[PDB]
């Protein structure tokens, strides 16, 4: 449903820029009666004094003397911005909520949840990437072990992922500063071979 709101609220403004009549105004010609059209000898005159002298950026403010019967009623365009704007963003944030991407990474404009991309990328590779990869590689590990004889395990390697460096450096500073235990006992806490 959040896809159908974000498709349609974006196709709302696509259509509205393609089929909408705003005028800058309207030159109302009622006439001597209650109604009356103006002649083609007068309609060719009225265009040439509107095209040449009153339209464009270079004619922005001409006085437009109005005779008896003529009238200039300037039309507006009252909802100008923001046709389904905070519902299109609210739908575009509920799409990112379902797949699990945080709104910082794709660039959805919203109140900040994560701070500085060191924790937005770290939450991305921990909530919706590495749980998804540890289920696909675990089904690869069992299915491909039906082809060779020995059962095989095949799981994600967190050590070689740059998004978990903020996880990794506070680990290495935890037991690195723990000087009470020996050097061969802190290599095994990090996954290093003791020498």
């Amino acid at each position: 449903v959040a896809l159908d709101v974000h498709n349609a609220a974006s196709a709302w403004s696509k259509a509205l820029l393609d089929n909408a009549a705003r005028p800058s105004g309207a030159i109302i010609y009622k006439g001597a009666d209650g109604q009356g059209v103006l002649a083609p000898e007068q309609y060719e005159r009225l265009i040439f004094e509107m095209e040449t002298h009153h339209q464009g950026a270079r004619n922005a403010g001409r006085p437009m003397l109005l005779e008896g019967g003529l009238d200039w009623k300037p039309m507006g365009f009252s909802p100008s911005d923001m046709e389904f704007h905070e519902t299109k963003a609210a739908a575009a944030r509920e799409i990112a909520l379902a797949f699990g991407v945080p709104p910082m990474l794709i660039g959805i404009p919203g109140d900040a949840t994560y701070a500085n991309y060191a924790e937005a990328n770290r939450a991305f590779y921990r909530l919706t990437v590495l749980p998804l990869l540890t289920r696909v590689s675990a089904a690869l590990a069992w299915w491909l072990s039906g082809y060779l004889g020995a059962q095989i395990e095949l799981k994600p390697d967190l050590d070689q992922v740059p998004a978990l460096a903020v996880e990794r450096d506070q680990l290495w500073a935890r037991i690195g500063a723990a000087g009470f235990l020996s050097n061969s006992e802190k290599r095994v806490l990090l996954g290093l071979p003791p020498t």
């Binding site: 001597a32 002649a39 040439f48 001409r62 006085p63 437009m64 005779e67 019967g69």
Partner: protein, 182 residues
């Protein structure tokens, strides 16, 4: 810009025999009081009388629209000096016949220049036709709906039909929307 007319209408061209049927010195005194009232609202001429537009400075360099609207055959463009040596020019411009804007469009060049003091004047014969049977009939009907009012009531007294005087001359008036600089 004066635009005084050269010759008035003779009165033999006015339909005083037709105005009498619609309803001679008093009838003809009421048509030309109703012809001149309709021309002044519509900026027309109705009898093809001769004019002299004597103006002091050209508004544009490929323009100076003429105010009396149905024009034909601009006779001369006399370019006088201050003492009045009166040398007419004969080339450079074109009369562009247009009921909307009767203008002098020039010939891809600035219009004839005016001497210091010597006001340029234009004489032209503007109007529909030389007789009364050459008019548009509704503008001829609007004269009779007004001149029969001046006949049938003498002072400014009291009394709107669908096509009245105003609804018939609403389509001959000059529709202008420029009160600007150019």
């Amino acid at each position: 810009m004066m635009l005084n007319e050269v010759t008035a209408v003779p009165g033999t061209a006015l339909p005083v025999a037709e105005f009498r049927d619609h309803l001679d010195a008093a009838l003809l005194s009421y048509l030309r009081a109703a012809i001149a009232a309709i021309e002044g609202r519509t900026a027309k001429a109705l009898i093809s009388r001769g004019f002299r537009l004597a103006l002091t400075a050209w508004r544009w360099g490929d323009m100076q629209t003429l105010p009396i609207a149905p024009v034909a055959t601009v006779t001369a463009l006399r370019l006088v000096d201050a003492a009045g040596v009166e040398t007419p020019v004969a080339a450079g411009w074109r009369l562009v016949p247009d009921m909307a804007r009767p203008r002098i469009e020039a010939l891809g060049a600035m219009l004839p220049m005016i001497p210091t003091g010597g006001r340029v004047e234009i004489d032209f014969t503007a109007g529909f036709g030389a007789s009364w049977s050459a008019l548009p009939v509704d503008l001829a009907q609007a004269v009779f709906l007004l001149a029969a009012q001046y006949y049938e009531l003498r002072h400014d007294g009291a009394a709107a039909m669908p096509f009245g005087v105003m609804a018939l001359i609403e389509r001959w008036r000059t529709v202008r929307v420029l009160g600007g600089r150019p």
